[PDB]
Amino acid sequence: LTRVDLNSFYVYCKGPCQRVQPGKLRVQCSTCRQATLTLTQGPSCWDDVLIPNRMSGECQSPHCPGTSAEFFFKCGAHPTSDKETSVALHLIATNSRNITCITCTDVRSPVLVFQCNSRHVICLDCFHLYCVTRLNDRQFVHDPQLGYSLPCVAGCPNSLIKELHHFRILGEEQYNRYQQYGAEECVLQMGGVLCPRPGCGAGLLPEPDCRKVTCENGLGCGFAFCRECKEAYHEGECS
Amino acid sequence: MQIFVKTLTGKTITLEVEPSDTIENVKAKIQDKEGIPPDQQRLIFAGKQLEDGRTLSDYNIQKESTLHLVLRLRG
Amino acid sequence: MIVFVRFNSSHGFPVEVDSDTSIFQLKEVVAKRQGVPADQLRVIFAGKELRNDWTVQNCDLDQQSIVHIVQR
Ligand SMILES: [Zn+2]
Ligand SMILES: [Zn+2]
Ligand SMILES: [Zn+2]
Ligand SMILES: [Zn+2]
Ligand SMILES: [Zn+2]
Ligand SMILES: [Zn+2]
């Protein structure tokens, strides 16, 4: 697993690195969650390690009939425990061939490879700014299947980042803001409403027909408002 | 592992979960803490609505990460 | 360097090895610690059993990584 170069892979280390780091591919047994399973064959693509249960083996634990392999990643920047895992940022690759950043044209490493047809390559600096600026301007795209993402910076079709942990490049505070905005957008995409009472903003999913929306045990602020004008609930037409 | 469920008001609930716990499990836990019936709960991670059948590991939801909780109003 | 040894899901204790230490040598010290024969021990690391003749560095064992060792 270690010698596989599907050019090291990169994780987001939440601690103590708090950054994108070269990762280690490892594997446990998907049944007893112990790193005793031996792989039948090694993974050849990302799908082999990312798709659950895709690869098989034999858990060498005495009382375990585990056959399915569960791949996990660890930060390679320091010793990690057996369960001290990190999310794989599979779009990030060592820029071994010195591909120039689609945006700033500089050669940096590593880089993010957009899954557009052109496999557009962006340095992490530009990706960070691309993310920060698009976030602040509410330019992140909501996809009902994928979530709150960004396409290729070139704007290539069918290029929305699927692994949304890539937006870990936003740093902690902006990442949480991203998650917040995404959830808000999701609510609005599902035809819901954000509670308009100041210091609230609770995501609400009322009946599509309902005009009366009550921000109802400790979650809502109790404000009963009109869906349309967002003022205190009223009979008849708005204003 | 410890995860956080936050309403869009920033109201935060801590959950003890396993990466193998289903979204339906998460909701049951949310109900256990706050008393929100699971049918009213919609969990969102990074803008994607989490499906009851899937697990946290299905979404690569890490230790100390945050799910967003919004409410399905039925009244 | 140090290698962590998880012996049948037991808490990983450290084993100081050398770059050229064989897997069997590692099996020995573990066997001495666990009071078991070294022949009934298998060394699982990175989804592959490590063969007795392989050296620590050969197996791409990084400093303070973990190897599982099971029995029979
Ligand atoms: Zn790290
Ligand atoms: Zn097992
Ligand atoms: Zn750049
Ligand atoms: Zn592109
Ligand atoms: Zn409210
Ligand atoms: Zn109105």
Numbering used by the authors:
A (entry chain A): 102 to 107, 144 to 353, 356 to 378
B (entry chain B): 1 to 75
C (entry chain C): 1 to 72
Reproduce, without paraphrasing, sentences from the article in which this PDB structure was first reported:
Furthermore, C431 on RING2 is occluded by the RING0 domain of Parkin, which inhibits Parkin activity.
We wondered whether the lack of density in the ACT region was due to the preference of ACT to remain associated with the cis molecule rather than to be complemented by the trans molecule. The ternary trans-complex of phospho-Parkin (1–76+77-382 + pUb) with cis ACT was crystallized, and structure was determined at 2.6 Å.
